[PDB]
């Protein structure tokens, strides 16, 4: 009887009254999936939420997302009735239903009361990372698709291919603040993996500002002067001047060199019109020197990061906001977009292919002669076409670097190619030297269906013409990448599965333990120059003991000191190269770690809390890149041999030899 | 050259390569493969004739009532396609097979007494193939992808460095069967020739040789030779056999004439063997050492002494040979084996089967089969003979023995089906030979070991399943019968056939409903390859191997058109110009180049023959006749693109599309544009939306005509003639008599599909293109369909596009669109939905369709009629009532207060309730047609009587044509005969038609006879063809048309590969205008051009702008009303294009009313035909831009749509052709948070279905485990949406507005406590 | 069922000290926002 209730025991599942049906199982009530069925796949289905398609909305402030009016009604009714009878503008809640039944304007104003400062949380289905769960403020958009702030999509790693988001609603007081707290977009502007700004200006934004801070030889107004970036506005947004003219302006820049006060320092720069207008964007605290650069995707990356480490977060946040609007703003003001007249093939390409023909034709005759073997000529074909491609490269790249020669104080004078494709190769947005070589030049040698390399490259160029055989070689590679995504994704979740299955309950429970013990952080100088330096390993930790300088007994960093930006800069100035740092495994704290042994680095940059469970976040951030995972010695530098751990002996002719396998060759 | 459609719109031919390969029936792979299947052939055509021969005469044991084969015959198509489409019954022909049932005589030379030949007896139906390539079985047309697998024959594989993982590379082989079993061959560097059956364990070759009983010496002589050794005058001499010296180290003096040829030190290779053959001296002195160590063949104990010391096959040494030489033996027969080449494999296989008899050998073979159970000698022997030797078991048709012998380098392509040991053991000996070095292995990508069993071929094999399944119901009626009891249709049945051929045509893995939204997608679904086939391949094993593509597929297979997920390299498409071979291979067009001139002799090859011949390239410059302008042409020896000569060519690639597929042909300027936008390009082409106005491509390829016409979305004519009664729903053609049937005259009637439902619920409607008062040509077109216009594949629409990053509205993928499109709605799709209504008799209440609804008002019936069916023409939404459904309720549902009123009022009042068919929340619709399907026998009331009466008149209106036309012919005929019987001309005009007189009155009546017997016919289908499913014989299907438009969030793309999603569709007010003031329509991102490399995409933009540029010329000057000659001048520039090759210009027939009319057609753009490997060049596109009103660069000066300042450095503009994937906002927006979960538990309702909320994933779980706030996840999946009472306690709480709660033990959690509280471990909560 | 046996016979008194545990019972973990929450709770358990 007991058994039949549970799992029919394990004796056999005796059927029920004259029926093909085992007696009922509460085991099949306490062992289904993940134990029970809330926690199992399929438990619940979120209320106060909406799974809806997405869309841009280039005007959305960094702190707000867009929600459809129809969706709004459906999701906030209870709050709408809670309001309609807490105040009392509705007769009854039944008549309240009848008001939304009639779509009466009154309840839409009560809808304004339940949304205009009531934040929401957002999430996508394919999301495997914590950076895919964020919060914004709602904005009543009449439509059907959830809009967003453009650049945040890169965080969710969500393009516009059918990303249906389930936007959640923090009902309780707690969750509402928690949204605007840690889950606010404007706060997790750093990656828990590395202390760098998680969002890098995409590309539309950057070409707009590439066209802002920009140098062109033909400049209208090239020489005038201004006293205010505001009248700069009145010159280009009007149309009388160019956005590139070399104007001498007085930028009275500021610097928080005081105890929090931005010191006044006057200065005039040989800047371009757009950079003056870029100052209207750049907050005083941030200096004009960093923004007197052509602005690339990587430049603008560290650009936002400096504004943070120096001036702060608030400036940076509303600054990047400014950037977004003006990034796309002058992207329009850009005009120049694409040119067929730019994609010119040099008659040097056709010339080297002529050589690349005659050459292997002779090398094939060396085969009909028996000098080079099939295999030696196999790699030989590889050999000269490689050289041939690099020579054609040496042509198409210089063509696309100095060829824009417009008149100015003479007959002609060069400037960096104004050729749009090159602009994407300068801003480094989405046009790289290899992609360029693959449209306007010979692709190169490709992988064969076996995985090895076919001796013959893709002869011509895609921009012009090839045939299906050349195509089959290329089809391999394309289909290659495809297969990869298709499998990697599933195993990543399963990887983080076993990962959470091992770390979940690890919580930081103390701050300081009571031990000097830590481990050794070292730059893994292997092969050539260091692969992974000293600084980035120390970034966000605490020195084990009172560390000395090469000068003995001169402590450059006392035992318990948090090593952040400035101290990392400090450990890069000193000659110290090996730093013992307190480790999370050497932590004296049992059943947890101390704030010190951990550090500060996360989305935050402050001391890790007592209550912050590092266990789970460790898991996800190591499994986040899961989807991503797949002769003589003559150095070309200048140093000096410092033989280590080896007995070297002089022989005849005064030369030197090595008597062991343990041999590191240093380059002091 | 010019047709009646080419007088309307001729496709401007770019014309570079001369016409030589004419488009044949591109779907013979379907039809003619099916033609090899079903066809009357005394010859024995591989199909139905060969199959029923290969099995009939069917004789069984001790019955002797042998059923034999004659022929077969088909029934009539059961309906027309249209009815098989609407109703949904299998489009088939009842197979009537001619069978000969004869009974023999026991104890006599078998005499036939009763030769009762029951011809055309019912052996089930067989779905017929409609003459387009589809199957109309259940509703809409479904399709089956022909599949590839290893071809029957013999093949070699190596597995080099993958059979040892140490350095020992193997070379093994498998003998592929057709209809039988495999014979696997384990060959290893371990010097062992093992055999295995199909995929079984490791057996020695000799486990069956001894199991046929061949002793060691009968084994080692057939395989290995006998080197005859001579011992004379007590000295060892070797009769030198130089060929047996292949692979051996010269460790002794190999001297002839004293002159040492092969010396001691350097071994024997190949030159010194010939130095022995140079002077033919075959006698060498071998030290005693050399022979000491070889195996003897015969029994050589001491025949001079008298003792038995050894047995046979035992070594010789400085002991045993020292006895055979002092005794006196000269001739000693040994056996040959060596180490380098010929290894002692069979020697190292004998004693692996530790038996010396067939008895225990078979025990060993059966012990290999299954363990534990007893092997019997009798059962094993009978088994073997009836396996590879029994014919109904093993087979290898003209395919088996063909590739068998050709891989054996033999000559015969034919032979037996059952195995022949001569041939088998040759393979085994050659197996050794490949595991030596003398002979190599093959690849799997060589199509010689690849057989594509087509749709009809595969059908024969599936039908074979059916044939044997019921053959067990035949042979046993031959055993349980006597003499004449068993008759055809007493033995044979119908269901097995149904659950066999339909099992293939409707239940096969490659058989599924044709994605009907793009005629192209319909054709490529038909003409397609499937690597995942029956006895083929799977993807959970292959990592990427099956997926990559080999170069021997050059010319017949196209990889471009394939999906994106795990189905890459699995669901590949074929090449346009491919042709079905009988063996299951392919035959591909190659122009026979007779050493100089490229003759039009077109030969056919497969990868077998490609590997043997050298074929020239087609992209090479040839002069006039075919004599290459250059001394060279890049040819391919085995698929080797290299420098070859003008005289080394055997064949030459025919046309530019002999390798191209329909999907890639549609994409112009291939040679250019990147392969990735190409894959994803043809990808999105199988997703072209069926828009209302189907705009034809400005710049095309010529395949536009080749899809819109070669699909089933067009009403083609088998005859030509003046249109008689063109309507929207019917196309009556008054056919010309030179092609009109001399048998019962004839006219062409075509009922067009009218706004019906498709597979993808999108409106499909053939539209009448030909207007009244215009004849047609035979094989021409009368109707178009969606995604097609005037017989031209029109997927989307093309218009003014500009390239510029405009205020973030082109961010990452975003496209910017002008409000004009939705303001025109020329881009709207109509999704119609069919909602089946289940009803009809439950055991508790005979269900009716409501006819009354309780406890509500007459509003629910003011929209319905007395029947309860909603009137045709309304519009529903939200949760309206469509049709009413009666449904039994229950005594349980009634109270004692209303059990008193049941004794008064009646039984059927509160017994059945109203649980009608309702519209779930979130669904809109427009009733356009409500199809009720009456129970056969018991029809409905007056409402259904109006519907049946409607289709009855729909039959009368069409049945009238047939009559009328001969009634006129014959009447004028009457008008001339009666005058010969006494003039009555004016009189007959005033007299009744009943005035050859006998004959004509007759024909008149026969047509009228036909008239009524067809009304009867049609009405029969209408009245009793409504039976659907057993039990539920009354099903009410309602259609709901819902127009879905373009809006902020739609996914728009292009053919070229570029994708996009509309960010914010702005008013046309914000459109950048040119020097003239023309508003742009689309704005795209320029930043994607360099990366994605969409170059051909922009070139088609300029020629598209040129196709409209010339239109600009025409239009202006045409509004001025100028003569037909002026425009003609522009047309001539427009038809010479430049000064290159051709276009086949006008002025053959009168160009007055042809080109001035063609001008009314070209004042909107010009459809161009274009080759993909040598298409429009720079100066060619420039010639056309400058012929209109356009500048060189095509970079026009536009002013800001919001300001007016010119975009610096003019923006590149033009006209791009679009492509809208079917991904709509309506389809993925699931705005439900809560509506209702389930009924039995709190289980979700669907995943992609209605009432959609976020399916809480487990990855989502771990992310929420990362964020330090447990609380929000805590409540989210326990307190909220888990505690059935806890969220209602929260509902009743937040409808006040005060977030404040307590912990949440999920009650079932308290049952966990209770269950172990029931065991003994009583969990508590102390303090 | 493995777990049934595994801790049932030992009667392993695990005072809800882990996150996963806290969530199936639907209560604040002794960390994060439930830190000070369970702080009051922990010194209220077997102490006070």
Kindly list the residues from chain B whose CB atom is less than 8 angstroms away from the CB atom of residue C33.
1268-1271
Angle B484-B490-B493 (CA atoms, 0-180°, nearest 5)?
A: 155
Partners of B197 in the beta sheet? B183
The beta-carbon contacts of B48-57 under 8 Å, at least 24 apart in sequence, are B48/B72, B48/B460, B51/B460, B51/B463, B51/B464, B51/B467, B52/B97, B54/B395, B55/B392, B55/B467, B56/B99
- Burial readout B456-488 (b: 16 or more C-beta within 10 A, e: otherwise): bbbbbebbbebbeebbeebbebbeebeeeebeb
Interface touch C34/B1309, C-beta < 8 Å: no
- Three-state SS letters, B394-446: CCCCCCHHHHHHHCCCCCCCCCCCCCCHHHHHHHHHHHHHHCCCCCCCCCCCC
Report strand pairing: A120-123 vs A133-136: antiparallel
Q: How far is CA B211 from CA B312, B365, B378, in A?
A: 20, 9, 13
The C-alpha atoms of residue A302 and residue A290 are separated, in whole angstroms, by 10
Preferred mutation among A327, A472, A494, A611 to probe B, highest tally of B CBs within 10 A? A472
The C-alpha atoms of residue B1165 and residue B1109 are separated, in whole angstroms, by 8
Report strand pairing: B1168-1169 vs B12-13: parallel
B731 and B762 in contact (C-beta within 8 Å)? no
Sheet with strand B228-231: strands edge to edge? B283-285, B236-239, B228-231, B331-333
Question: Out of C18, C19, C35, whose CB is closest to A610?
Answer: C35
Q: Which two tokens stand for residue B663?
A: 């999907």
Alpha helices, DSSP H only, in B1093-1185? 1096-1119, 1124-1136, 1152-1162, 1178-1185
The C-alpha atoms of residue B285 and residue B332 are separated, in whole angstroms, by 17
Interface touch C32/A612, C-beta < 8 Å: yes
Give the H or E element holding residue B970.
helix B942-977
Kindly list the residues from chain C whose CB atom is less than 8 angstroms away from the CB atom of residue A27.
1
Question: Out of C1, C19, C23, whose CB is closest to A613?
Answer: C19
Question: Out of A178, A504, A611, whose CB is closest to C20?
Answer: A504
Preferred mutation among B1270, B1283, B1304, B1318 to probe C, highest tally of C CBs within 10 A? B1270
Q: Which two tokens stand for residue A542?
A: 């605490």
Number of Cβ within 10 Å of residue B106's Cβ equals 8
CA distance C6 to chain B (A): 13
Partners of A249 in the beta sheet? A226, A269
Interface touch A160/B1280, C-beta < 8 Å: no
Question: Out of B1304, B1316, B1319, whose CB is closest to C26?
Answer: B1304
Number of Cβ within 10 Å of residue A595's Cβ equals 22
Closest CA to A644 of A660, A664, A667, A668: A664
User: Is A476 in CB contact (< 8 Å) with chain B?
Assistant: yes
| B-proximal residues of A, 231-260, CB under 8 Å | 239
Interface touch A53/B643, C-beta < 8 Å: no
B447 and B529 in contact (C-beta within 8 Å)? no
Preferred mutation among C23, C31, C32 to probe B, highest tally of B CBs within 10 A? C23
Partners of B587 in the beta sheet? B579
Closest CA to A384 of A363, A414, A412: A363
Report strand pairing: B814-817 vs B1061-1062: parallel
B1101 and B1058 in contact (C-beta within 8 Å)? no
Question: Any residues with CB less than 8 A from the CB of B528 and at least 6 apart, and which?
Answer: B145, B146, B571, B572, B573, B574
Using DSSP's 3-state secondary structure scheme, residue B383 falls into helix
Interface touch C18/A504, C-beta < 8 Å: yes
Number of Cβ within 10 Å of residue A70's Cβ equals 14
A97 and A105 in contact (C-beta within 8 Å)? no
User: Is B1279 in CB contact (< 8 Å) with chain C?
Assistant: yes
B996 and B969 in contact (C-beta within 8 Å)? no
Number of Cβ within 10 Å of residue C13's Cβ equals 8
The C-alpha atoms of residue B1217 and residue B801 are separated, in whole angstroms, by 9
Kindly list the residues from chain B whose CB atom is less than 8 angstroms away from the CB atom of residue C22.
1270, 1274
Residue of C nearest to B1323 (CA): C11
- Three-state SS letters, A304-373: HHHHHHCCCHHHHHHHHHHHHHHHHHHHHHHCCCCCCCCCCCCCCHHHHHHHHHHHHHHHCCCCCCCCCC
The C-alpha atoms of residue A349 and residue A353 are separated, in whole angstroms, by 6
User: Is C18 in CB contact (< 8 Å) with chain A?
Assistant: yes
Task: Kindly tell me the burial class for residue A382, based on how many C-beta atoms sit within 10 Å of its own C-beta (0-12, 13-18, 19 or more).
Answer: middle
Q: How far is CA B1243 from CA A43, A398, B1047, B1235, B1247, in A?
A: 7, 65, 34, 13, 11
Partners of A451 in the beta sheet? none
A440 and A396 in contact (C-beta within 8 Å)? yes
The C-alpha atoms of residue A110 and residue A89 are separated, in whole angstroms, by 9
Closest CA to B788 of B725, B703, B720: B703
Going by the annotation, the residues of the binding site of A for Zn(2+) are 513, 587, 594, 597
Residue of A nearest to C39 (CA): A611
Partners of B767 in the beta sheet? B784
CA distance B1198 to chain A (A): 9
CA atoms within 13 A on the CB side of B31: 9
CA distance A502 to chain C (A): 12
Interface touch C32/A39, C-beta < 8 Å: no
Question: Any residues with CB less than 8 A from the CB of B858 and at least 6 apart, and which?
Answer: none
Kindly list the residues from chain C whose CB atom is less than 8 angstroms away from the CB atom of residue A610.
31, 35
A243 and A208 in contact (C-beta within 8 Å)? no
B1253 and A45 in contact (C-beta within 8 Å)? yes
R_g over Cα of chain C: 13
Report strand pairing: A547-548 vs B1168-1169: unpaired
The C-alpha atoms of residue B224 and residue B212 are separated, in whole angstroms, by 19
The C-alpha atoms of residue A90 and residue A83 are separated, in whole angstroms, by 9
Interface touch B1316/C8, C-beta < 8 Å: yes
- Whether the CA torsion A409, A412, A415, A417 is positive or negative: it is positive
Residue of B nearest to C25 (CA): B1305
R_g over Cα of chain B: 41
Interface touch B1287/A47, C-beta < 8 Å: yes
CA distance A612 to chain C (A): 6
Using DSSP's 3-state secondary structure scheme, residue A551 falls into coil
Interface touch B1279/C26, C-beta < 8 Å: yes
Q: How far is CA B650 from CA B556, B587, B593, B597, in A?
A: 19, 17, 6, 11
Interface touch A7/C18, C-beta < 8 Å: no
Kindly list the residues from chain C whose CB atom is less than 8 angstroms away from the CB atom of residue B1273.
23
- Burial readout B18-32 (b: 16 or more C-beta within 10 A, e: otherwise): eeebeeeebbbbbbb
Number of Cβ within 10 Å of residue B405's Cβ equals 19
CA distance C13 to chain B (A): 9
CA distance B1322 to chain C (A): 9
Interface touch B565/A486, C-beta < 8 Å: yes
Technique that determined the structure: cryo-EM
Interface touch C33/A616, C-beta < 8 Å: no
Partners of B933 in the beta sheet? B1035
Interface touch A47/B1281, C-beta < 8 Å: yes
The C-alpha atoms of residue B1184 and residue B1111 are separated, in whole angstroms, by 11
Backbone φ and ψ of A58, nearest 5°: -65, -5
A311 and A258 in contact (C-beta within 8 Å)? no
CA atoms within 13 A on the CB side of B1154: 15
Axis crossing angle, helix B1152-1162 with helix B1096-1119, rounded to the nearest 10: 120
- Three-state SS letters, B220-268: CCCCCCCCEEEECCCCEEEECCCCCCCCECCCCCEEECCEEEECCCCCE
CA distance A505 to chain C (A): 6
The C-alpha atoms of residue C42 and residue C25 are separated, in whole angstroms, by 17
Preferred mutation among C3, C5, C14, C19 to probe A, highest tally of A CBs within 10 A? C19
How remote is the C-alpha of B624 from its chain's centroid?
40
Number of Cβ within 10 Å of residue B822's Cβ equals 17
CA distance B1265 to chain C (A): 9
DSSP letter assigned to residue B845? B
Question: Residue holding tokens 């048998």?
Answer: B743
Closest CA to B1251 of B1239, B1261, B1260, B1264: B1239
B832 and B761 in contact (C-beta within 8 Å)? yes
Chain A to chain C Cβ contacts (< 8 Å): 33
Going by the annotation, the residues of the binding site of A are 159, 161, 163, 513, 587, 594, 597
Angle A600-A606-A607 (CA atoms, 0-180°, nearest 5)?
A: 65
> Which are the residues after which chain A is interrupted (C to N > 2.5 Å)?
630
User: Is A617 in CB contact (< 8 Å) with chain C?
Assistant: no
């Amino acid at each position: 009887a007991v058994d039949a209730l549970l799992d029919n025991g394990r004796r056999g599942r005796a059927i029920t009254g004259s029926n093909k049906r085992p007696l009922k199982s509460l085991a099949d009530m306490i062992k289904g999936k993940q134990g029970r069925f809330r926690q199992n796949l399929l438990g619940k289905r979120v209320d106060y939420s909406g799974r809806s398609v997405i869309t841009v909305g280039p005007y959305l402030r960094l702190h707000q997302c867009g929600l459809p009016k129809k969706m709004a009604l459906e999701l906030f009714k209870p709050f709408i009735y809670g309001k309609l009878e807490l105040r009392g503008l509705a007769t009854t809640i039944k008549a309240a239903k009848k008001m939304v039944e009639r779509e009466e304007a009154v309840v839409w104003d009560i809808l304004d009361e339940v949304i205009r400062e009531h934040p929401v949380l957002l999430n996508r289905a394919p999301t495997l990372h914590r950076l895919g769960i964020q919060a914004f403020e709602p904005v009543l958009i009449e439509g059907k698709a959830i809009q967003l702030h453009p650049l945040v999509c890169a965080a969710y790693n969500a393009d516009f291919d059918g990303d249906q988001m389930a936007v959640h609603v923090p009902l309780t007081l707690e969750a509402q603040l928690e949204a605007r707290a840690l889950m606010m977009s404007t706060n997790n502007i750093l990656s828990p993996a590395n202390g760098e700004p998680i969002i890098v200006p995409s590309q539309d934004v950057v070409l707009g500002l590439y066209y802002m801070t920009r140098d062109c030889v033909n400049a209208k107004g090239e020489g005038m002067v201004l006293t205010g970036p505001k009248e700069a506005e009145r010159l280009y947004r009007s149309g009388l001047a160019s956005l590139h003219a070399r104007v001498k302006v007085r930028i009275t820049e500021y610097e928080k060199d005081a105890n929090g006060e931005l010191v006044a320092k006057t200065s005039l720069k040989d800047t371009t019109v757009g950079r003056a207008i870029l100052w209207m964007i750049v907050p005083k605290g941030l200096p004009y020197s960093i923004v007197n650069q052509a602005l690339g995707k990587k430049a603008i990356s560290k650009m936002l990061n400096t504004c943070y480490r120096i001036l702060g977060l608030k400036p940076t946040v509303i600054f990047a906001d400014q950037i977004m609007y003006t990034g796309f703003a002058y992207a329009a003001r850009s005009g120049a977009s694409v040119g067929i007249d730019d994609m010119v093939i040099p008659e040097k390409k056709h010339e080297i292919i002529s050589e690349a023909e005659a050459e292997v034709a002779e090398i094939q005759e060396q085969f009909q002669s028996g000098l080079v073997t099939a295999g030696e000529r196999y790699n030989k074909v590889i050999d000269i076409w490689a050289a041939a491609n690099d020579r054609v490269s040496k042509a198409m790249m210089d063509n696309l670097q100095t060829e824009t020669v417009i008149n100015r104080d003479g007959q002609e004078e060069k400037q960096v190619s104004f050729n749009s494709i090159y602009m994407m190769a300068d801003s480094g947005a989405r046009g790289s030297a290899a992609q360029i070589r693959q449209l306007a030049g010979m692709r190169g040698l490709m992988a064969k269906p076996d995985g090895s390399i076919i001796e013959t490259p893709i002869t011509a160029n895609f921009r012009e013409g090839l045939n299906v055989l050349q195509y089959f070689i290329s089809t391999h590679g394309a289909r290659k990448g495809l297969a990869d995504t298709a499998l990697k994704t599933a195993n990543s979740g399963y990887l983080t599965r076993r990962l959470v299955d091992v770390a979940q309950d690890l919580v930081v429970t103390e701050d300081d333990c009571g031990t000097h013990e830590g481990i050794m952080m070292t730059p893994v100088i292997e092969g050539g120059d260091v692969k992974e330096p000293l600084r980035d390993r120390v970034l966000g930790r605490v020195t084990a003991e009172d560390v000395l300088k090469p000068g003995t007994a001169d402590i450059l960093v006392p035992r318990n000191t948090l090593l952040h930006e400035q101290w990392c800069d400090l450990l890069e100035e000193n000659s110290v190269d090996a730093v013992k740092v307190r480790s999370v495994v050497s932590c004296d704290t049992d059943f947890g770690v101390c704030a010190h042994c951990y550090g500060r680095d996360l989305a935050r940059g402050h001391i890790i809390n007592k209550g912050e469970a590092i266990g789970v976040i460790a898991a996800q951030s190591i499994g986040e890149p899961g989807t991503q995972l797949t002769s003589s010695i003559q150095v070309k530098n200048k140093g000096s041999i410092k033989l280590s751990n080896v007995k070297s002996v002089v022989n005849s002719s005064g030369k030197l030899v090595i008597t062991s396998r343990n041999t590191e060759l240093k380059l002091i | 050259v010019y047709s009646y459609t080419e007088k309307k719109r001729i496709r401007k031919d770019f014309g570079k390569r001369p016409q030589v390969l004419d488009v044949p029936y591109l779907l013979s792979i379907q039809l003619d493969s099916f033609q090899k299947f079903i066809e009357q052939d005394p010859e024995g055509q591989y199909g139905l004739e060969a199959a029923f021969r290969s099995v009939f005469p069917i004789q069984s044991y001790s019955g002797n009532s042998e059923l034999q084969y004659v022929s077969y015959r088909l029934g009539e198509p059961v309906f027309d396609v249209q009815e098989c489409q609407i109703r949904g019954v299998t489009y088939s022909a009842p197979l009537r097979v001619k069978l000969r049932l004869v009974i023999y005589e026991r104890e006599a030379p078998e005499g036939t007494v009763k030769d009762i030949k029951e011809q055309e007896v019912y052996m089930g139906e067989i779905p017929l193939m409609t003459d387009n390539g589809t199957f109309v079985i259940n509703g809409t047309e479904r399709v089956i992808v022909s599949q590839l697998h290893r071809s029957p024959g013999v093949f070699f594989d190596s597995d080099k460095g993958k059979t040892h993982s140490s350095g020992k590379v193997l070379y093994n082989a498998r003998i592929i069967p057709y209809r039988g079993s495999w014979l696997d061959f384990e060959f290893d560097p371990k010097d062992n020739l093992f055999v295995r059956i199909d995929r079984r364990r490791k057996l020695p070759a000799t486990i069956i040789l001894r199991a046929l009983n061949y002793t060691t010496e009968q084994i080692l002589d057939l395989f290995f030779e006998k080197v005859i050794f001579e011992i004379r005058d007590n000295k060892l001499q070797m009769e030198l056999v130089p060929e047996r010296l292949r692979g051996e180290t010269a460790s002794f003096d190999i001297e002839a004439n004293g002159k040492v040829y092969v010396e001691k030190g350097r071994r024997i290779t190949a030159r010194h063997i010939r130095q022995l053959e140079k002077d033919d001296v075959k006698l060498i002195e071998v030290p005693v050492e050399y022979i000491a160590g070889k195996v003897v063949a015969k029994d050589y104990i001491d025949e001079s002494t008298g003792e038995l010391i050894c047995a046979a096959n035992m070594e010789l040494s400085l002991d045993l040979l020292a006895k055979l030489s002092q005794s006196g033996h000269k001739r000693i027969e040994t056996l040959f084996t060596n180490d380098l080449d010929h290894g002692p494999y069979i020697s190292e296989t004998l004693r692996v089967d530790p038996t010396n008899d067939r008895l225990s050998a078979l025990v060993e073979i059966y012990r290999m089969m299954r363990p534990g159970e007893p092997p019997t000698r009798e059962a094993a022997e009978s088994l073997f003979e009836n396996l590879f030797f029994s014919e109904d078991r093993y087979d290898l048709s003209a395919v088996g023995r063909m590739k068998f012998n050709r891989s054996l380098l033999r000559e015969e392509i034919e032979g037996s089906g059952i195995l022949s040991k001569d041939d088998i053991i040759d393979v085994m000996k050659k197996l050794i030979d490949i595991r030596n070095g003398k002979g190599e292995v093959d690849d799997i990508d060589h199509l010689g070991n690849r057989r594509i069993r087509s749709v009809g071929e595969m059908a024969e094999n599936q039908f074979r399943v059916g044939l044997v399944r019921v053959e067990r119901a035949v042979k046993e009626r031959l055993s349980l019968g006597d003499l004449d009891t068993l008759m055809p249709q007493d033995m044979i049945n119908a269901k097995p056939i149904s659950a066999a051929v339909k099992e293939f045509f409707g239940s096969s893995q490659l058989s599924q409903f044709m994605d009907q939204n793009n005629p192209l997608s319909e054709i490529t679904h038909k003409r397609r390859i499937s690597a995942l086939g029956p006895g083929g391949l799977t993807r959970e094993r292959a990592g990427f191997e099956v997926r990559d593509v080999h170069p021997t597929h050059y010319g017949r297979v196209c990889p471009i058109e394939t999906p994106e997920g795990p189905n890459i390299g699995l669901i590949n498409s074929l090449s346009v110009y491919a042709q079905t071979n009988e063996y299951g291979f392919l035959e591909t067009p190659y122009r026979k180049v007779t050493d100089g001139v490229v003759t039009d002799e077109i030969h056919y090859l497969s990868a077998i023959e490609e590997g043997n011949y050298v074929i020239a390239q087609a992209n090479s410059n040839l002069d006039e006749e075919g004599h290459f302008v250059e001394d060279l042409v890049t040819c391919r020896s085995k698929g080797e693109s290299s420098l070859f000569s003008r005289d080394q060519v055997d064949y030459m690639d025919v046309s530019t599309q002999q390798v191209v597929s329909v999907g890639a042909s549609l994409i112009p300027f291939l040679e250019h544009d990147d392969a990735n936008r190409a894959l994803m390009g043809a990808n999105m082409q199988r997703q072209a939306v069926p828009t209302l106005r189907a705009d034809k491509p400005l710049v095309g390829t010529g395949m536009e005509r080749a899809v819109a016409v070669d699909s089933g979305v067009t009403a083609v004519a088998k005859r030509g003639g003046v249109v008689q009664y063109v309507d929207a729903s019917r196309i009556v053609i008054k056919v010309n008599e030179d092609e009109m049937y001399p048998g019962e005259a004839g006219i062409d009637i075509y009922n067009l599909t009218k706004y019906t439902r498709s597979n993808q619920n999108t409106c499909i409607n053939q539209m009448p293109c030909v207007s009244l008062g215009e004849p047609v040509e035979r094989g021409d077109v009368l109707a178009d369909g969606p995604s097609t216009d005037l017989g031209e594949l029109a997927l989307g629409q093309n218009m003014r596009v500009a390239f510029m990053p405009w205020n973030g509205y082109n961010f990452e993928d975003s496209i910017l669109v002008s409000e004009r499109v939705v303001q025109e709605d020329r881009f709207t799709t109509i999704h119609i939905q069919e909602l089946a209504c289940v009803s009809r008799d439950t055991k508790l209440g005979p269900e009716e369709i409501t006819a009354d609804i309780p406890n509500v008002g007459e509003a629910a019936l003011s929209k319905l009629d007395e029947s309860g069916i909603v009137y045709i023409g309304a519009e529903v939404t939200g949760g309206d009532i469509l049709v009413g459904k009666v449904t039994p309720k229950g005594e349980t549902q009634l109270t004692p207060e209303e059990k008193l009123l049941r004794a008064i009022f009646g039984e059927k009042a509160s017994d059945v309730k109203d649980s009608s068919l309702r519209v779930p929340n979130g669904v809109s619709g427009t009733v356009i047609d409500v199809q009720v399907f009456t129970r056969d026998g018991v029809e409905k009331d007056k409402r259904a009587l109006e519907i049946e009466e409607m289709q009855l008149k729909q039959a009368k209106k069409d049945l009238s044509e047939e009559l009328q036309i001969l009634e006129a012919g014959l009447f004028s005929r009457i008008r001339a005969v009666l005058v010969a019987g006494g003039v009555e001309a004016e009189k007959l005009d005033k007299l009744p038609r009943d005035r050859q007189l006998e004959q004509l009155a007759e024909q008149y009546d026969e047509l009228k006879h036909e008239f009524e017997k067809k009304l009867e016919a049609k009405r029969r289908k209408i009245t009793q063809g409504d039976d659907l499913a057993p039990g539920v014989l009354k099903i009410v299907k309602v259609y709901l048309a819902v127009k879905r438009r373009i809006q902020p969030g739609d996914k728009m793309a292009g053919r070229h590969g570029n994708k996009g999603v509309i960010s914010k569709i702005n008013p046309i007010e914000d459109m950048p205008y040119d020097e003239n003031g023309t508003p742009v329509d689309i704005v795209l991102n320029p930043l994607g051009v360099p990366s994605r490399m969409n170059i051909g995409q922009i070139l088609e933009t300029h020629l598209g702008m040129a196709a409209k540029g010339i239109g600009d010329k025409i239009n202006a000057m045409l509004k001025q009303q100028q003569e037909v000659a002026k425009l003609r001048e522009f047309i001539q520039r427009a038809y010479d294009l430049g000064a290159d090759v051709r276009q086949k210009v006008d002025l053959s027939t009168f160009s007055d009313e042809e080109v001035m009319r063609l001008a009314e057609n070209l004042r909107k753009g010009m459809p161009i035909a274009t080759p993909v490997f040598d298409g429009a060049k720079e100066a060619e596109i420039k010639e056309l831009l400058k012929l209109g009103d356009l500048p060189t660069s095509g970079q026009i000066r536009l002013y800001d749509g919001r300001t007016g300042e010119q975009f610096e450095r003019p923006v590149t503009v033009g006209y791009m052709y679009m492509l809208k994937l079917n991904h709509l906002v309506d389809d993925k927006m699931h705005a439900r948070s809560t509506g209702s979960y389930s009924l039995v538990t709190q289980q979700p309702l669907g995943g992609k279905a209605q009432f959609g909320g976020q399916r809480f994933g487990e990855m989502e779980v771990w992310a929420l485990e990362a964020y330090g706030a447990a609380y929000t996840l805590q409540e989210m999946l326990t307190v909220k949406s888990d505690d059935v009472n806890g969220r209602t306690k929260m509902y009743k709480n937040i409808v006040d507005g005060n977030h404040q709660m307590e912990p949440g033990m999920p009650e079932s959690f308290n049952v966990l406590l209770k269950e172990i509280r029931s065991l003994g471990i009583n969990i508590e909560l102390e303090d | 069922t493995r777990v049934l046996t595994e801790a049932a016979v030992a009667g392993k008194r695990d005072e809800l000290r882990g996150l996963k545990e806290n969530v199936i019972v639907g209560r604040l973990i002794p960390a994060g926002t439930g830190y000070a929450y369970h702080q009051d709770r922990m010194r209220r358990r077997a102490a006070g």
